[PDB]
Symmetry: C2
């Protein structure tokens, strides 16, 4: 099929290099810990309880392994609580393999002030390129822990000029190292534009996963994106009818259509769940309880897969999505 072509390094997890064959079933987009930009400024009342986060996270890790999930890809942006050392902790404690990311979030929800300022003063793209390259090849913050993927994100109405700085830096790092790229699309838009842009810049589509594609329910939009040869992920499975999100029933309808059209090799599945929130614990209005009810990392293993199988999807298609595709994209 379409194999990764160009520079290449074996999958880097927070605990070191891992062979593609050892990745096993994988959730390509989750967040062990996560905090929206600003969470740190609420440190007095919402401090990080490391002991509790570690207990809870490892328990979630252990439950994933119970389900045969050997690997999780943590997509947390550098300014949203990324903590490679903590992920290494969670990994060494449970045996769950974790890959972390390098990247900043979309303009609308990221810690954008910094690079927007540096971009006004000089060559920010080049500076973003050096950070990503260093994090992928040498390590994050002096820990030696390397990023196994680059995380890119765009806004709803366009991939903004600020966002494009990151897309150009990542493309260059991609070309030079072969590292995988995973993305965020805001509210079901810009999937095709991200794929076009990344490929146009020389990024290997065999190493690109356009995310939150489940955010759009017109399969035409998905096919237009797949036309580029990149993989696409229904990665907010379980987050229903909230923040623009469709219902899982809607996602499944699109998914089985795409599956029935032969796209298994290019479909990945995830929850975009957060195991432990940073800042003060989120206050969940009762009315939103159903929207987040299945939004946890065991939902696909326990509800989705069995539901695709009973719908006609095959053990082979499911293994392609959950093991085949990840092995090739990140391995």
């Amino acid at each position: 099929g379409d194999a990764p072509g160009g520079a290449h390094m074996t999958a880097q997890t927070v605990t070191g290099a891992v062979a593609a064959a050892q990745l096993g079933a994988t959730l390509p987009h989750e967040h062990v810990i996560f905090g929206y930009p600003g969470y740190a400024g609420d440190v007095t009342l919402g401090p990080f309880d490391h002991a509790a986060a570690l207990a809870s996270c490892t328990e979630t890790a252990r439950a994933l392994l119970a389900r045969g999930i050997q690997t999780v890809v943590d997509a947390t942006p550098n300014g949203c609580g990324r903590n490679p050392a903590f992920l290494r902790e969670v990994s060494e404690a449970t045996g769950l393999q974790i890959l972390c990311a390098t990247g900043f979030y979309y303009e609308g929800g990221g810690a954008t002030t910094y690079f927007k300022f540096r971009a006004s003063l000089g060559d920010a793209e080049s500076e973003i390129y050096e950070m990503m390259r260093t994090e992928v090849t040498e390590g994050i913050a002096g820990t030696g822990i390397r990023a196994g993927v680059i995380k890119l994100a765009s806004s709803r109405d366009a991939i903004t000029p600020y966002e494009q700085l990151f897309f150009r830096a990542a493309a260059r790092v991609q070309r030079e190292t072969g590292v995988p790229i995973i993305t965020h699309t805001q509210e079901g838009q810009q999937g095709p534009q991200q794929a076009e842009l990344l490929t146009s810049l020389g990024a290997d589509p065999a190493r690109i996963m356009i995310g939150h594609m489940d955010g759009n329910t017109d399969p035409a939009y998905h096919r237009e994106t797949l036309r580029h040869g990149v993989s696409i992920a229904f990665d907010r499975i379980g987050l229903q009818g909230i923040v623009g999100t469709p219902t899982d029933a809607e996602r499944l309808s699109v998914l089985t259509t795409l599956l029935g059209e032969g796209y298994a090799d290019r479909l990945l599945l995830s929850h975009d769940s957060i195991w432990h929130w940073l800042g003060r614990p989120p206050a969940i209005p009762e009315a939103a309880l159903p929207a987040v009810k299945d939004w946890h990392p065991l939902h696909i293993s326990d509800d989705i897969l069995p539901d695709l199988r009973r719908r006609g999807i095959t053990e082979e298609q499911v293994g392609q999505m959950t093991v085949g595709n990840p092995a090739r994209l990140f391995g």
Copy 2:
């Protein structure tokens, strides 16, 4: 004149309570360390060199004392690098008294994602109120170091709904504790609106300093703001013709007019300087060199004051601005 009326606590500096009479000459708006939101996500290439920052900061501290400045008010927002423990370090090492702030920055340049999200889920104002109240009365991040002022900020075109959450929480904390409030106005606008809003909410104008008023060169705008009984600060003195900023000559023209109209008791002067930047050191395009040439904390002491005196301003007016006003506002 107009003395602080209501609840009251003695000036809290990062090293403890200080009598109003011991504040001495003060710079009401500076930043020992500062980083635009996102700086932390650039930690791999732009890590904090604590030894160098401490050496440099204390040297700046020592130079301020050489000039008789006994106190500095650090206006750094919770998500812009605020570090009470480091300020205590700089203070205990030199004897320079430092007050730190509690508050988030304006929507356009702050770490806004967090509270914008919490506001969508619940009562963020109340949450912001608890943080500010706890930081002012008990301490920041478990250090015991209390905030001596609340920092509020608004955008250019309006005090946005997100910003108003902070203005309402601060007003309440102001009413209950008497703590001073200092603000940021973006590009010479919203000074009058901030003053109106804060007073309308029950905040004591004798404890309110509307900042970056030097950003507007129409004295009419300043008088309209002073009409509220609040103090106003020309606090970006030295930052010239850049980021919308006027020249110092322009600021001085407005200042002597206001001074000649009897407003000394309500005028404060500062630089809004940054002693040590967080993130990778700022790259200064040569063309901007003159704009930042006098932008350091010795500029007012060495250039401005002597320049107001030779312009006719009196030793008494200068002492009112630099010692009288601070004593009353923060003491």
